[PDB]
């Protein structure tokens, strides 16, 4: 389990972000005020991370989420110190009404698009994405899958050097996709499947 947020250390670090109250009642949420002033996940923090997708060749990532409407908001995203661009990046889109995917490799961007994924309601809404291998299954609170499927297998944007040339950056996006709202409980977990997450908190 690699809880961004924490990690960061947002609610002892840096600004961007006022501490709210979410959906768990025993863990901060964060509304989220600048992008760019919380702090990244620390390099030791993300190859640990990276090593774990690098392992299960893919990932759970876990996130509680109070999005304004109409918008286009960036739930994390792994930017390049070189600064220029993202190799990695999710998105609740929501003028599409989706939750896009994108993924970078060799100067190649490619962006996929998990249909009928409408999270920018301005309430509270849970997602337990679900990326393994070229394959994406998300499931919002406890309403039915939606499936897309990557263009080139997730651990291949994944690589073993990550670390150094990009930092995981939450809340963040492109010049124009930086999270507008209440985010919470923004996780990664490892060796757990979607299916127990979905028991695990009573669907």
Request: net charge neutral; aromatic share 6%.
């Amino acid at each position: 389990v690699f809880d961004i947020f924490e990690l960061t250390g947002a609610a002892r670090k840096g600004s961007g972000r006022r501490l709210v109250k979410g959906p768990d009642p025993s863990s901060p949420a964060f509304r989220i005020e600048d992008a760019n002033l919380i702090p990244p996940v620390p390099d030791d923090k993300f190859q640990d991370l990276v090593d774990a997708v690098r392992t299960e060749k893919g990932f759970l990532l876990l996130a509680s989420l109070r999005q304004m409407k109409k918008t286009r908001g960036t739930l994390l995203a792994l930017e390049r110190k070189d600064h220029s661009g993202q190799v990695f990046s999710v998105v609740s889109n929501g003028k599409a009404g989706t939750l896009d995917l994108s993924l970078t490799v060799q100067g190649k961007q490619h962006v996929v698009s998990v249909e009928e994924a409408l999270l920018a309601t301005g309430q509270w809404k849970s997602i337990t994405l679900f990326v393994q291998e070229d394959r994406a299954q998300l499931y919002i609170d406890c309403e039915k899958m939606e499936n897309a499927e990557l263009d080139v297998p997730i651990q291949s944007v994944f690589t073993r050097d990550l670390a150094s040339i990009a930092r995981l950056r939450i809340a963040k996006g492109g010049v124009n996709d930086n999270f507008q709202g209440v985010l919470q409980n923004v996780r990664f977990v490892f060796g757990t499947t979607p299916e127990d997450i979905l028991r695990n908190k009573g669907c």
